Amino acid sequence: VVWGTNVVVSQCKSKFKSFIMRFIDPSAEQDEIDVNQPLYLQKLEEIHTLEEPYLNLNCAHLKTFDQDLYRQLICYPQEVIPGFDMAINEMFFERYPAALLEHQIQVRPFNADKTRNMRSLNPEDMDQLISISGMVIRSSNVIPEMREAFFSCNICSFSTTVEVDRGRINQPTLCTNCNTNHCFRLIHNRSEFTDKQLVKLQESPDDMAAGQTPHNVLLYAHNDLVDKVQPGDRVTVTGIYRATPLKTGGLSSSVKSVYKTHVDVVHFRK
Amino acid sequence: VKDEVGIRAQKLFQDFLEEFKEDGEIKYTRPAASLESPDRCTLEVSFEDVEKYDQNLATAIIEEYYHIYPFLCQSVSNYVKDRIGLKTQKDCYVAFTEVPTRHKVRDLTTSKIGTLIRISGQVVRTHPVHPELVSGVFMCLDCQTEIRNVEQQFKFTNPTICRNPVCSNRKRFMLDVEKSLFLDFQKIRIQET
Amino acid sequence: RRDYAQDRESIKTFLSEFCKCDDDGKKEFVYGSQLVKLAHREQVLITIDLDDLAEFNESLAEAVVDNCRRYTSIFSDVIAELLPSEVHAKDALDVYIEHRLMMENSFPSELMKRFEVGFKPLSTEKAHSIREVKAQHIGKLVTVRGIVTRCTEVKPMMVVATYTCDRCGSETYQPVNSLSFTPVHDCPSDDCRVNKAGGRLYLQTRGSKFVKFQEVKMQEHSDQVPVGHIPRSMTIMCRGEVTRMAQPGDHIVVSGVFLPLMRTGFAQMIQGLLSETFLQAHRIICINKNDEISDKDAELTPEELEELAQDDFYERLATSLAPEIYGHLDVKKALLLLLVGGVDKRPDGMKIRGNINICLMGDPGVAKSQLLGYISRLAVRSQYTTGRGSSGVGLTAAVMKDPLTGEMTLEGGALVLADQGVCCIDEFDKMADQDRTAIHEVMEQQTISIAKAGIMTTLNARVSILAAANPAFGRYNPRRTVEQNIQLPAALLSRFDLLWLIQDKPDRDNDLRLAKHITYVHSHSKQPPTRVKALDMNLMRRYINLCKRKNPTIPDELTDYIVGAYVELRREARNQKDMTFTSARNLLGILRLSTALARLRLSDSVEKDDVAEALRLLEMSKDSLNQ
Numbered sequence A: 001v002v003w004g005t006n007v008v009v010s011q012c013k014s015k016f017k018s019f020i021m022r023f024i025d026p027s028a029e030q031d032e033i034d035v036n037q038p039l040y041l042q043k044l045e046e047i048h049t050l051e052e053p054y055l056n057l058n059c060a061h062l063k064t065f066d067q068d069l070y071r072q073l074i075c076y077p078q079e080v081i082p083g084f085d086m087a088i089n090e091m092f093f094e095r096y097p098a099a100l101l102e103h104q105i106q107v108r109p110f111n112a113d114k115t116r117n118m119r120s121l122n123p124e125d126m127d128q129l130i131s132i133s134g135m136v137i138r139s140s141n142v143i144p145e146m147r148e149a150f151f152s153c154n155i156c157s158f159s160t161t162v163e164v165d166r167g168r169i170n171q172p173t174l175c176t177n178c179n180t181n182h183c184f185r186l187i188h189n190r191s192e193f194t195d196k197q198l199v200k201l202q203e204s205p206d207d208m209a210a211g212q213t214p215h216n217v218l219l220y221a222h223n224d225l226v227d228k229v230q231p232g233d234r235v236t237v238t239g240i241y242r243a244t245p246l247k248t249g250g251l252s253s254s255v256k257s258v259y260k261t262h263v264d265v266v267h268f269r270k
Numbered sequence B: 001v002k003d004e005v006g007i008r009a010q011k012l013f014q015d016f017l018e019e020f021k022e023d024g025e026i027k028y029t030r031p032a033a034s035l036e037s038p039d040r041c042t043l044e045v046s047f048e049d050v051e052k053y054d055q056n057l058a059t060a061i062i063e064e065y066y067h068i069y070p071f072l073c074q075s076v077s078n079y080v081k082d083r084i085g086l087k088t089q090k091d092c093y094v095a096f097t098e099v100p101t102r103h104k105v106r107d108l109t110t111s112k113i114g115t116l117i118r119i120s121g122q123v124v125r126t127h128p129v130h131p132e133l134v135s136g137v138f139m140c141l142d143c144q145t146e147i148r149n150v151e152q153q154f155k156f157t158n159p160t161i162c163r164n165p166v167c168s169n170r171k172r173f174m175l176d177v178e179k180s181l182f183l184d185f186q187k188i189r190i191q192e193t
Numbered sequence C: 001r002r003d004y005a006q007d008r009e010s011i012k013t014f015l016s017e018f019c020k021c022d023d024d025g026k027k028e029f030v031y032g033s034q035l036v037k038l039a040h041r042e043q044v045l046i047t048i049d050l051d052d053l054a055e056f057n058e059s060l061a062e063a064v065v066d067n068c069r070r071y072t073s074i075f076s077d078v079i080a081e082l083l084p085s086e087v088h089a090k091d092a093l094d095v096y097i098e099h100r101l102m103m104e105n106s107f108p109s110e111l112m113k114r115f116e117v118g119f120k121p122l123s124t125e126k127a128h129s130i131r132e133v134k135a136q137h138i139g140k141l142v143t144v145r146g147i148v149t150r151c152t153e154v155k156p157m158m159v160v161a162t163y164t165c166d167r168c169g170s171e172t173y174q175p176v177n178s179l180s181f182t183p184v185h186d187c188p189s190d191d192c193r194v195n196k197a198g199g200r201l202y203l204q205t206r207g208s209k210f211v212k213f214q215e216v217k218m219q220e221h222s223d224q225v226p227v228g229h230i231p232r233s234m235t236i237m238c239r240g241e242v243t244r245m246a247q248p249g250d251h252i253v254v255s256g257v258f259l260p261l262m263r264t265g266f267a268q269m270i271q272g273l274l275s276e277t278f279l280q281a282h283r284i285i286c287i288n289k290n291d292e293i294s295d296k297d298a299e300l301t302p303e304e305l306e307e308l309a310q311d312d313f314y315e316r317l318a319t320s321l322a323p324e325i326y327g328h329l330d331v332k333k334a335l336l337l338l339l340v341g342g343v344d345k346r347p348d349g350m351k352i353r354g355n356i357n358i359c360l361m362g363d364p365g366v367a368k369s370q371l372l373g374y375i376s377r378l379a380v381r382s383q384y385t386t387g388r389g390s391s392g393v394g395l396t397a398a399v400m401k402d403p404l405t406g407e408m409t410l411e412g413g414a415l416v417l418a419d420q421g422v423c424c425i426d427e428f429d430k431m432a433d434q435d436r437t438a439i440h441e442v443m444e445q446q447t448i449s450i451a452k453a454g455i456m457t458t459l460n461a462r463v464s465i466l467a468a469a470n471p472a473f474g475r476y477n478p479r480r481t482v483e484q485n486i487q488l489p490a491a492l493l494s495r496f497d498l499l500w501l502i503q504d505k506p507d508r509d510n511d512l513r514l515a516k517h518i519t520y521v522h523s524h525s526k527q528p529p530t531r532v533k534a535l536d537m538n539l540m541r542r543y544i545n546l547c548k549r550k551n552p553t554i555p556d557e558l559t560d561y562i563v564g565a566y567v568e569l570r571r572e573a574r575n576q577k578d579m580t581f582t583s584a585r586n587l588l589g590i591l592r593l594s595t596a597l598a599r600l601r602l603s604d605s606v607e608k609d610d611v612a613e614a615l616r617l618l619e620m621s622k623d624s625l626n627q
């Protein structure tokens, strides 16, 4: 088990694999297509006959099996997903062995339910699953973000790099150290960068407090979901309460009791 | 190091245009011949000619541009030195052209760096000349301050340790505004196409 | 002064030896019922009342009211380690604690909060006022009434933040109760002691806490302000499990404890020993316009049936509105149509607005501002403004820094908030020049487009409009016509449903009638004597709400004749060449009034005589100058 968890990657892996195999499009073939096959090998055909990646799911498929995985994916989604990625990459080889097995796919779940709407929220739903909606406000520009740097030297060309864990980096007296020929040389260009961007959002279904302005929220972005949508649309969100402190002052390093909240990016609904 | 391949490649590019470049004729020395008197430090080059004779240095040039970029100034220097009594005053301005691909603001991500892609727009709220003593001379204060170094970096940094002595590395020598490197640019914004 | 030991035993005895027998069937333990209720994990905050502590003891019946900060924490650790009564994995915090010990520097019981206590004084003690909190209200749990203003939304506060070195697996406890703090260094442990085996510990909210943390602004009543002063305000920090216990426009009654505040920072402006205080509370019993005084938190049928069949009339509900004069009968009933409305549907995807918007024209003395100022009071969620009483941004949204977040959000004006109701305006002509477009926009309902930032400025205003303005020099000069004597945008005049002009020429025997009418407003404080029983406002409030929920159909058997009614409508005004405009939207209007009128029937039985009043209503709405 991982530290603050009570689960295992392999059990979820196996049960999701069996679920996708025990699948006849049952979410609308059992519940509600001339296909008595999994939609998922059908979809890997659709993904590989195209070689157009980027799947998506809906969490109503996963009612047919145990309701436990719904629960233990609501509670710990930030820790459980990539096991489903390796299940997908097993299904890759099951569909075709010499396929393009180096380009990786997302997973885009959705649809537990509307909470009530964005006005009426609590603390305890702090790292779990939500889906609300309203209207879009802006369309702003994208930002790089570091994960590793380039470095140098003068004698023998110590041309090196070292990456980020999340916020903690190392350096000996050299880069690629042997015998300490100099001190550490920093450049920061010849490097890897990731896309992200902020876009504000409204509440305007009729889920409105009478005589009240919409209390508005905000969303980050990640690489192949950045400006995924043009403004002036009603779109639903799929994401996780993801919090961060605030910096008291700035002249000092003290920090404020008010942790902020914002939602990460999983999937949207045009 | 990466760009030694580009060194050899533009070396033999030089060595070919050292002879003819087009049908016993040359189109990329007579600009240098006019250059030879004032030494204004520009020679633009067709990218199509890279597709003619050097056989696809585009994917050699068009992704890792910025790291290859400065090596092409040294390439230019190795060209101009071959025939004129030459000092290292020679410099690299570039006005690249003859490139097929012409894209817009929207196809921009973190994976688009070190390229030569082509864009249009409109000109607004332009801004002036703004000089820059990009270079100078800087080391300890005992005697040994003659520093032709790389202090032209974007983020600028006084601190240099030494060349000859073992001395202070936080006490700087003063600056050079006399026998150094200065250059000229400007800055604007541009709107959607 | 007092002791922490026999006092502790006394409060434990109070916890246990307590079967306060207020009446029959009370032989068990009230606080022991509350105890086992904690044992259910159902209740998470006990409310306390002095009567219990009035009968038990007297110290702590007056000792805790001034401090409130120690005896509560003793109450905390008293009950926190009292387990008289499975399951472990039910609460997200507790299940994370049981994660963390099922995985396995002492943990406090402060970490396992898991239950709370507040208070409830006896006899809302009195309405102590925000001004009169003078130099003796530090620490004292005082009862006071205020007025709400500028509420923001729920935020999670933190109390204890734990790191872990990742080299010694340290689970540190760094509790915080103020606003600002700093975490600890890389290894404040003993396995990670001065010994080199040290990494750098890092925060995990999993085994940490958060708390409901709401904030609003609090403004004064504007009834007890000094004679030559200005309204003041105070700040709230309503903690615990009372977040979302107020709304903008609730005359609330809040009961808590005044406390001081240290806005730590620059030691010169701040650090002057000046005490920029703030408030704390636990209980929000809003005694005006809240869940308590307003029921249904109107649809409750049985309690009203006794009066429902008790009376059967409509005009009885008619002149009960502003009943201090006589006259203008046909205006009040149709105005009452404005309060109810109730015609909502989604036919063919297109939504139809059911909010009547009418104006008042001609004012050589009519009591124009009286109906507005009255109905804005009786009509729940109303407003009132005038021509130069507010700019365009005063009517529309605006911007201001946010004490909750600082997001610089948008806050709206009068019309921005009066939706689902009626926003009243008076003296419309001299409002502003560009304002006419601002009111031209509400005729395409739920559409408040602004150019403040000028990006979208989208907003859903579903308000009615109660317009009222004056004629210029003169009142229908013998040659003048509409749009000549009035200098309002005729396009704006087009977008109304009922136009209403009030002209009073000399009536040699009506003047004495009103003179005896209004003079009796002053010798006493009630007009209608011994001729009918005008209804209380409070019963009015529910009687109007019950009519709304019907949403009848339309009678096709009269649809054949409603069009003929529109025929005579558009013809008897068309018989002359240059009478005032008669519009094609009339057929879209007559349908919208007969429905709300049937709403007070609550029957879905719109009849042939139902519109028989509407026909004369619009009939007299124009041709107001014939005699």
Ligand SMILES: Nc1ncnc2c1ncn2[C@@H]1O[C@H](COP(=O)(O)OP(=O)(O)O)[C@@H](O)[C@H]1O
Binding pocket: C324, C325, C326, C327, C363, C365, C366, C367, C368, C369, C370, C426, C470, C514, C518
């Ligand atoms: N018959 C009446 N009954 C009661 N009040 C009246 C009557 N006639 C006149 N008044 C008085 O006339 C005043 C009219 O003011 P109003 O017309 O509202 O100002 P404005 O013309 O600026 O709107 C009212 O405040 C009311 O006190």
